[PDB]
Design a protein around this ligand. Structure first.
Ligand SMILES: CC(=O)N[C@H]1[C@H]([C@H](O)[C@@H](O)CO)O[C@@](O)(C(=O)O)C[C@@H]1OC(C)=O
Ligand SMILES: CC(=O)N[C@H]1[C@H]([C@H](O)[C@@H](O)CO)O[C@@](O)(C(=O)O)C[C@@H]1OC(C)=O
Ligand SMILES: CC(=O)N[C@H]1[C@H]([C@H](O)[C@@H](O)CO)O[C@@](O)(C(=O)O)C[C@@H]1OC(C)=O
Ligand SMILES: [Mg+2]
Ligand SMILES: [Mg+2]
Ligand SMILES: [Mg+2]
Lengths: 325, 330, 325
């Protein structure tokens, strides 16, 4: 019997299936109250948070413990999200991001961007199809992103008419980076996301499987390799067909999550973990009920009083007979 | 009897009356130790935090629970804080802010701002009367603030010599916004505050009335409409006259807050709430003291021991009689 | 016997000796699991974090309680870090930083920087010797840093060919500031760190002595003046020689920290403090075992049963004798 830590020192990191504040309840999988901090956004993921579609909805857990139930939306990242030469693979970017949300002491901070000329700051939907901040460079220049010693991941998207990275001609599209970069001969527009900083990694989580309506992309499928992974109800790896639609509201997922979050009388303060098996979880101590012991004392005192009375009467009775003797 | 959650998973969100580390005690209303995180700044409020007067003192709760005791300072926002055309009203901006502090998963982050030409970054007191970061545009241009899809509120203040929003001529002053905006033909200076982001809203709070020495402005008065609102001592709606001055140190408010924060032996870990009525609060389990039960056993044992020998003596006394009677000739 | 708060509402603020996720265990002094949030980074300090060496590793506690075990690395700040005219002294900068980490409601945020002309944003190792974000001004101008009313500390480093502060000629190097500044006639490059904001100061900490392999610099030695200071094992004030090297892994420091973090059955939820002496710490409540009290009742009930039998016989015997008389 799985018991998930349902407690104020825990952050639930989710997508629409957990976005209790903003999603029609029919599409929710998390339908029980979560006593911790809920960070869940319809459409979002640990990669998608860097796209610019949800500019105010970055995940920023600050608690010791986390429970993750997301990933399906990150499967909409594809070849064009790792097409800039020298970008990380999606497999590697996703592994670092899921490690950070699960275990990391994390921050979301502005990413350094600069250049040999002043770039024009604006916003446009021309680079990604939706509105994001960009720098526009009207002549070819050196463009720099990130700083030596950084520890985190940021996303870049370009619409360049010229440029190269270390002599390799750039390709328009996006990439993930966890090191500083330098573009030479760059002209055009550049989008740079904030940095998901991942520093120490001694926080703790459960990673609940997030299933899609088709088999998972490789970079999310690989979350199965993390010690914290826990399976959730699925049909051959695909989201069950017992929900509001093919992707939300699964009756069986709802039951799995509600049961695990409502284990009775667990003293979460006594275990350093984001979950435990019910028989092993520490239990709340209750007030001792002394009613039985008191009833026993009272009954004993009653009978001893009776004996006291009988003894004195037999003493008088013996005296009565000896007087007669 | 009201019990307020006094626990490390709670943030107290306040102004001078709770700013224990920086305000003379004669002016405090929170005069008892708060076991949670204290974020309280003299002169500040959820609107005023966006003004630029207190550039390092934004409210940034990150805990599940909150207790709010502020609002009086937000009544210094007025018509000139909602005068930029298309600005939110103060009623709606404050509603969104107080909801976010109370229930929100919130952040404070830099607000996007850009333009069709490069703006000059500086600081000045010419826009608001005190020093804030501004962009100066010396020729008319397109100015853009915020991004589609954003979820939060930011403040804008302008000192423009030309410009319009959607063809409506700009008016100098400030406004609050929770959507991106675009100014055309803009020349002059623009201040843009950071964004108070409000995302999910499943955190929990109590909202304690913050009274002024005059009747509350409408945008703070409407906080009474929120489920979390709790009245605090006041005289016809105004701060009581039993304090250090007309706005601070009320004896009766102090007693109200101290009493509510010192309920004995509440096990806050067992209730998912920022307050409870005392009789309904879960109580700490304490070690059982068995001394009285042990005393009762010992008292009983002493008397039973006496009985053993009393009985022994009656047995010998009877047997004497039996033996003596047996000798009666038939 | 010292007991340190080992609980999810506590942040451990450390350097390599506590950097469990990134440092070989042989160099750790914190070798036991910490149930709170661990923010510890090799080479770091509350001053060194602002140097530009740690762009993603600023300390950002958000918990009520903290335990600090750092300072040794801050002793490499020296005269060149307080050489810009009107800079704070290192003594005063460190005092404010350690008080803020210990007691503060703190944030790390971008520091305002502006000028009378547009500065060129780039990165360079020319100002500090390693790559950081800078503005370049190729003609003389007014440069402004920070804002009136700010509450925190930031670091500035310059490589200027001209400039003054209030008519005092600038000197190249660094300085710490907790107020806005204005440079006139400035030409060259300027690095400005993020601001370590310190607002209210009602959070609570223990400040564990951090020893170096030589006597502490003045600005860290003075942490002994804080109420929260607690000595850790040392030899004449110097790091003990019983470790992996002269700066890490002390057997006696390890035992000191492990012992203090493993006090049994402390109910930290009942004490508003980052530490307590063992005998005074509140202890976890355990279920009461009533077995001995029940055994006592049974022993009594047995004897009372016997007395009932003996009284009955006494009654029979007195009746018999009376029958005869
Ligand atoms: C680089 C650029 O000129 N972006 C413009 C942008 C773009 O032309 C469209 O493609 C939408 O992307 O549209 C706007 O109407 C907009 O509201 O976002 C104005 C933007 O102007 C500035 C200064 O950012
Ligand atoms: C836009 C502008 O030039 N602002 C200046 C500001 C201004 O004179 C107003 O406050 C008028 O009162 O004052 C300063 O002395 C100041 O210390 O903030 C320097 C500022 O210079 C720069 C480059 O930002
Ligand atoms: C101001 C400047 O020109 N900085 C350059 C920087 C610098 O030359 C020193 O680090 C070498 O001493 O080096 C680079 O190769 C680098 O990869 O960081 C590119 C930087 O370019 C820009 C526009 O920031
Ligand atoms: Mg495994
Ligand atoms: Mg109501
Ligand atoms: Mg008994």
């Amino acid at each position: 019997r799985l018991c998930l830590r349902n407690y104020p020192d825990t952050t639930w990191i989710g997508d629409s299936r957990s976005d209790q504040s903003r999603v029609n309840p029919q599409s929710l999988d998390l339908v029980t109250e979560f006593k911790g901090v809920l960070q869940a956004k319809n459409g979002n993921g640990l990669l998608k948070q860097m796209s610019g579609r949800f500019p105010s909805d970055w995940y920023t857990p600050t608690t010791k413990y986390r429970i993750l139930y997301l990933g399906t939306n990150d499967c909409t990242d594809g070849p064009t999200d790792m097409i800039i030469p020298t970008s990380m693979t999606l497999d590697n970017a996703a592994r670092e991001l899921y490690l950070g949300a699960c275990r990391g002491d994390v921050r979301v901070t502005p990413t350094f961007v600069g250049a040999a000329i002043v770039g024009l700051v604006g916003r446009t939907d021309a680079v990604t199809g939706f509105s994001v901040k960009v720098l526009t460079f009207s002549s070819p220049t050196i463009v720099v992103v990130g700083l030596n010693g950084m520890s985190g991941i940021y996303k870049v998207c370009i619409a360049a008419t010229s440029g190269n990275v270390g002599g390799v001609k750039l390709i328009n599209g996006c990439g993930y980076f966890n090191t500083p970069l330098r573009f030479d001969n760059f002209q055009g527009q550049i989008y740079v996301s904030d940095t998901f900083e991942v520093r120490g990694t001694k926080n703790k989580c459960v990673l609940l499987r997030s299933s899609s309506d088709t088999p998972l992309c490789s970079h999310i499928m690989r979350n199965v390799e993390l010690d914290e992974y826990v399976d959730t109800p699925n049909t051959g790896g695909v989201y069950p067909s017992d929900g509001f639609d093919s992707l939300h509201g699964s009756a069986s997922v709802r039951t799995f999550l509600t049961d695990a979050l409502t284990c009775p009388d667990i003293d979460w303060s006594r275990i350093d973990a984001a979950s435990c098996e019910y028989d092993s979880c520490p239990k709340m101590v209750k007030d001792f009920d002394q009613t039985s012991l008191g009833n026993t004392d009272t009954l004993i005192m009653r009978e001893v009083a009776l004996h006291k009375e009988m003894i004195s009467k037999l003493q008088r009775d013996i005296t009565d007979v000896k007087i007669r003797v």
